[PDB]
Structures are given as C-alpha cells and as structure tokens.
Structure 1
C-alpha cells in the first residue's frame, strides 16, 4: 500500500487529525490518538479496550472467528483480545465482590488449617510399641554399637 496509507507521527492540528481519521476509516469525532508521550504509538487510533468476545456473535463478520470486518481499524492489542485470550465481557457479579469473596474464602481456609495444626485430632491411645529395641537393627542401626534397650510391658 502507498506510504500515505501507513501510520505516522502523532497528529497535532485539526487537519492532521482529520487526515489521520480518514486514513484509518473512522469518523473524525470517533478518532482519538494515544496521548503523545514518546511511547511510539504515533497516530494509531485508541480504540476501546474491549475483548472480541463482546462483539455480536450473530452479525455476519468478514472474519467470523476474529469477529472483525475487512477494513475496520484493529485495536492496538487485538492479539491480546482474540477470543482465545483476554476476556472483558460483563460478569453476573461485581468484579470487586468476586475478589472479596474469593480471597476471603482462601484466607479463611488457611486460618482454619492453621487452627487444625495447632489443635490436631487423635485417638486416646499410647505410642505404638515395636520389639527388639524399636527395631534398631531393621531400621539400619549400626550393629557394632549396642543400643540402650527399649522395654515394653504388659497391661
């Protein structure tokens, strides 16, 4: 495509805004550049940060999977907003409330797992008894040393 149809520097004047919008197939009212600050966007339009999942599924798009039409300006982060990646569609619950309930559930569970560790359950039973000095030799004890015997009595 001719050089005049490629992106350029940040627009400065109303005519540099008017020409940029026409280049991007946008209404001049709807055209808004990224704020000038050297980051490198240029005159590329700043389109709403909305996922492609949010677009009408029944409309006959030119690209049905991307839900894009041929010729419309692509969002700067379109590859981040394809239907396989970031989704921004509304949720039945508020975002802040989801975060509070989800974190609260996890924080509460960890608290009670700590209480469980401090006050474990167990049965009213003495320690298990093993013969031959707590199985000294079976557990790899060195035989040359003579271990202090462990003695178990009946009851």
Structure 2
C-alpha cells in the first residue's frame, strides 16, 4: 500500500524529460500535466486540476468508478477538491450574472428602502384623536356635553 513518504510530491519539474516522468507518475497524459507556478508557496510537482465551476459541474451520467466523488479509479485529485467539492463552493451551471451584480441588487434595494422608511418615520399616519385620558389624581378630565 505504501506510505506518505513514498507518495509525497517531487520537487518542481524543470525539464521535459522530467515533465514526462512527472506526468507518468500521476497517470496523466503529458498534456494535462501542469505544475503550480512555484512562486514559493507551490505544491511541488503536483498537478493543477479542476478549479473550474466545481465538481458538481462534471457529467453526472458518465459511469464513474467512484460516483460519490465523481472521480475515476487512479485519477489524481485536485489540491483544492475540498473547496470545489459538490457541497462546497461549486455550481452546476455558470451563474447568470457577474458575482458583483447580485450583491449590488440586493444591497442596492436594501439601502434604497432603508432611507425611504426612515425618511417617513416622522410622517406617521395617526388617527384624529387625543391621548388616553387615564385618570390621574388631582387632574381635571371633562366630558364635552354640558
């Protein structure tokens, strides 16, 4: 079965001869393989896969080896699969509008109606009546008729 030390990524690939072995090592044909940029936070020679609309956008009707993950037998797993998983930040179809659009409408409506409500807080519709004449001692409440 092996251990982690026998499976950790190798150092970033630098040569085509090294790329081809690296692509072999992950069961990828040499064209898919694409290591991370190696800015300094890179994952070594580990591939870069997914990062799209997410797992749930993969074809559901395909006969996957692991339908539950929607993944095949020896296929590698994206380093951020825990984020683009079916229950995490993923969608079946591209969103209708830009992500900025949604926030503007909801907040734009909300602010547009906060001001209106508070501007009318003074102009409360009141029935034409005086206050409850609760009987207080030493105070003089009358009745209109003589």
Q: TM > 0.5 between the two?
A: yes
User: Separation in 2 of the partners of 1:15 and 1:49?
Assistant: 27
TM-superposed deviation, 1:122? 2.3
2:90 maps to 87
Higher helix proportion:
1
Distance 1:132 1:11, change over 3 A: same
Normalised by the size of structure 2, how large is the TM-score?
Answer: 0.79
Gaps of 5+ in 1: 134-148
1:136 maps to none
Larger Rg: 1
Greater relative contact order structure (CA < 8 Å, 6+ sep) = 2
Gaps of 5+ in 2: none
User: Separation in 1 of the partners of 2:57 and 2:127?
Assistant: 57
TM-superposed deviation, 1:91? 4.2
The number of residues matched between the two structures is: 140
> What is the RMSD computed on CA atoms of the aligned residues?
2.3
Per-residue CA deviation, residues 111-140 of structure 1 (Å, 9 max, x unaligned), is: 22222324333222222221135xxxxxxx
Per-residue CA deviation, residues 26-55 of structure 1 (Å, 9 max, x unaligned), is: 122221111112214111111131311101
1:100 maps to 104
TM-superposed deviation, 1:4? 6.0
Normalised by the size of structure 1, how large is the TM-score?
Answer: 0.75
Dislocated runs of 4+, deviation >6 Å: none
Distance 1:64 1:123, change over 3 A: same
2:143 maps to 154
Matches within 5 A, 1:56-135: 56-91=59-94, 93-95=96-98, 96-133=100-137
